[PDB]
Automatic annotation (TrEMBL), chains A, B, C, D, E, F:
Subcellular location: Host cell membrane; Host endosome, Host multivesicular body; Virion membrane; Virion
Family to which the UniProt record says this protein belongs: Belongs to the primate lentivirus group gag polyprotein family.
Quaternary context: Interacts with host NUP98.
Source taxon at top rank: Viruses
Official protein name in the record: Gag polyprotein
Gene that specifies this protein: gag
Residues of the full protein shown: 133 to 363 of 500
Length: 231, 231, 231, 231, 231, 231, 77, 77
């Protein structure tokens, strides 16, 4: 990873082996969940395209999804390669050479080149660009390995509004729908898929209710259930 | 977050996945409680708005309570925006755009604007201001994860006064009770239901009395202040 | 806390969550015991009033007793405002204000105002003043919440002099009475409450013999217990 | 390890306790392994061959695997030496002899001589070379010690298609057979050792369809919680 | 403690909680035993007397020992005063002063002055002198907390000589014995008290034999069975 | 330890308990194996004599063995002294002395004077000389309590040539016989006392075969001992 | 303080014995504050406490008179 | 090997078996130090281990006298 000091000073420092493996530990506990994507998205930030590749290789589990991340990454390297075929040198001493989709994946490029691209005029940020490709990969897998879906879920005869809204907000993240569909999912379905007695109570509250009014409501129709609040 | 006084704005390290793993592990396991607040302060010092969004959104649980923390910010960033018009842009190079309330919170701001205010001269402290805005709503959602009520309170069948005061003040700070509120709860509940003999002394002290003189009262007179007898 | 191990210049550095964890544990798991007075003293090193306030505010339990600790500390603030009258504006334009007693207690001052006093030459000693008030307030609490008295404890009809000694020094460290009184306690209270067999030797030793000499004589009382005692 | 910046002087500095501590914990725990290989390459980043031989001898257990390691590197070192003879002079402080194979292997060189090969420009990188012959012996021992071969991999009658491809692509990374054969393993063996209900789905799907279509496919078989995911 | 941060002058650092936690686990788990004294040396690297005295006062019970220890430091502080071996001679007016026993103990000195004398030459390291007083009293506690005496200690008929020689050395370490004693015990009483096969073998070999000769001897005798063994 | 050698800012850095904790854990877990030896030299990189002494005394178990170590250390200090340069001429010549035995082990010499023979010309390294003597005392105890089982391990009917082969190599590395014994054992005992199905083909393969070359062998010999083997 | 003996009789022995005592004045204040109540009687401690620790000498000797009962029974002179 | 014949009978068949053997003298020293001694009696096990191959053979006959001729035993008289 690469650190920027004042006035033109750009230098490189290596990753800690513990801190490197701080995302892998998360998928051990969580699997593929939408909150895993910012967790990676922090660790990948300011990392060099070599480091970015170390991020994927240190995973010894989940080896089909890991191949499938490799597939998403190289399709977008080809798309870029269709954007920018390079046949020709830089023709100005002051100009650093155009990257091919292989360069950006960290396979054809050296540390001086990936650093020099960022210090180039206009600057070329091939790690930010490749990172997005990692996160596309990672978003695909989280969308594929979901345990549930917003149209399936409804509230149990003993579940209080408090818990069911917490899962309905959590569920709403994984769905990739448009804002007005996601808004209607909120406005219609949430109070439509409330249990028989809790719905009676949401109607007696009226149409405009705040989350604090509706969270404290239905606590005598349902009961607490598990402590951990994970399902 | 800053870790060197004059580091550049373009290439910046993110909030550590280690610092994140301490936090996500307390919040998902043990919810919101008052001692999260001083540790959030300890971990979020000099964090950018993208550092703080990362800290809020890398938790997968308790999503209802984070919509309120968000809706709270949404209130306040609008409050800043109804008094502060968008400044006119810079007039020369080396001088930066003034933040709008939506860019203090990370809405319309990207990372190198966020850290570029912070690494500017003088430093402009946009994630402090947003730090104040999170503390506002944290202290709110705390009271939703508060286990028991200071208004619906009684001392047990055979609970000592000494013992109940200890509990009453645990409970009183759990809702973060203001001085008139503490003085009215003292007057209407804590010294209400006492022994008549002890009550002469508790009328003379009243509710603005320090806890040392309050609790240690009536050790020479009267029955017990719990209803069951002690002889 | 204010630190000077990061560069040649003094700088502020944000409180550690491992410091607060560490301070809160001995207070919570054991309540208040004389051990609390070193534990604050090791880890309030370098602290600004604002750290010392966070360190007071962090403990989750014992909420009645911290209230008494807080009242006790703020009594000393008001005292210093009686003693040392000051002004809120400068003594003339281009000066910083002298701290008021409240500013000592961190209520009506900023982080920046506490760096400005502590980085001065010779330093204005606003954490060192407020650290002493808190230690002053510690002494009241560890006496008050001692579950034992020095006057009650004595030697029994089967106990070694070493066991009485061990109990006497632990309790007498905790008690805050006048030095004069504490010296009749080591010269006359220890000597008198001893077992009737031990008084004979403790006179032939007299008051000036060494602590090994006193410990080693009168050890057979009740027999040996060592292998049959807990430690 | 050798550290710091060339212009200011690179400096050699000691091996950290906590890293060495982590390396013996892990070698006991999960030995030589695919996620151990990037942990060794990132730990050994700065490492000299004296450092690589120091950490290799702290391993403890796995001594047949160290013998296998030791004869592959010795043979690599000997292959290098009979390939490339050294005709270097007698040298002085200020001059450096070109290295033999035995100098790569660490076996004829001390640390100072290793310090001065890496601080030449370009480096002679006796470290990166000795590393890659160690990773070459790491993949041989981790193939050898593979839990189950690709050849013997299968899908049982109620065993899921997803649990199966997970182990396929996993045992596929352990194997050190050539890549064209590994084309037939992926294309043929994966359908052919699958259960018959999936073998009908996979032949109809064919090599044209992508990975994501193959991972989406074949999930109504495998039991009730496979069904819920696609419905 | 006193750290170097590579800026050309000595500077203070706050104590770590991990040195405290290492000390209060050590005394708790193991009580007071010969390995806890070189552990305290390890925690005392570059601590001030103030840093050590905090550590001594951090312990709760065992206060008969703590007063014997606090007595022992003050004997050795009072000696270093009258012995004077830091003596300056006669000196002209404006040169740095001669400290005495109270300056080295830090009752009449402060941190920056103790630094003055380590920086001015010939160097005095104040916390070394203090360090060496504490563990002298600790040596006394580990003997007094051990009941076990060299002229008493026995073995049975079935036990190997190796266990009785381990045990004699863990005795002798807590006693810290003289040479006449070690001779008298080795040659006579240890040979005679040793198991009957080991006596017939040991006298023919040399009842005055060295520790390495003695651990060579008595092969095959006492302990488990009589064949299938290398000791 | 000292840190920063071959550089003008050579400095001390404290002993870590992480380091001691490693050494005591392993001496406890399995005592004197050959892997402790590199764990000492890996722990001791940069070590003072104080660091080297400190770490030896931190072990509580095994004191006869540790006392044998000190006997050995003392014998090397005497050996150093016998070959010491003669004391003659000027008592103090006005230059730094030659170090004797006591000095290297650290009993007459302290960190200001030890830096005095690393700065004084030629350089003398107290701790690297002393580390040589401690490894000889470890090596004497490792030799004395030698595992002794190479003759007595053979394979049963269903042994697959893996776990016992490692076990063969572990007692072979334990054994302190010469290279001329060790090279006979690897063409005789290894293969003659192999699993009997395998032993016929290890015979036709070649008895002086390499470890890699033996582990690939024995394919197609049939029987249940072949079924159990994975590769 | 004996079970039937009242404060007055007891605080009168205490001061006769205190005057004979050659102990420092701080301690004689400690002994009046602290030892006096604690070597008073278990059920009498409660009465002094209701009075509060800043009650007068007059008030001290007023306390527990009931527990000592009638003045013809046990004579002061 | 065992204890059933005297050490002199065993060592004599031992050195005949080392006589048949080709393998280098350092390995026949290690058999003489390790395997030879291991199947001896506990009584003289300490002594023979110092004598080993290192000391003169004739010395090895000084000990284990009184053991008895051909047959079962476990220690020496």
């Amino acid at each position: 990873p690469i650190v920027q000091n004042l006035q033109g000073q750009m230098v490189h420092q290596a990753i800690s082996p513990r801190t490197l493996n701080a995302w892998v530990k998360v998928v051990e506990e969580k699997a593929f969940s939408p909150e895993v994507i910012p967790m990676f998205s922090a660790l990948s930030e300011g990392a060099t395209p070599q480091d970015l590749n170390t991020m994927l290789n240190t995973v010894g589990g989940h080896q089909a999804a890991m191949q499938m991340l490799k597939e998403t990454i190289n399709e977008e390297a080809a798309e870029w390669d269709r954007l920018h075929p390079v046949h020709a040198g830089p023709i100005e001493p002051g100009q650093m050479r155009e990257p091919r989709g292989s360069d950006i994946a960290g396979t054809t490029s050296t540390l001086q080149e990936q650093i020099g691209w960022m210090t180039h005029n206009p600057p070329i940020p091939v790690g930010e660009i490749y990172k997005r490709w990692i996160i596309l990969g990672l978003n695909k897998i989280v969308r594929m390995y979901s345990p549930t879906s917003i149209l399936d879920i409804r509230q149990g005869p003993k579940e209080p509004f408090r818990d069911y809204v917490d899962r309905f907000y959590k569920t709403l993240r994984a769905e990739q729908a448009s804002q007005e569909v996601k808004n209607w999912m909120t406005e219609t379905l949430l109070v439509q898929n409330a249990n028989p007695d809790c719905k009676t109570i949401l109607k007696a509250l009226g149409p405009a209710a705040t989350l604090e009014e509706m969270m404290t409501a239905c606590q005598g129709v349902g009961g607490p259930g598990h402590k951990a609040r994970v399902l």
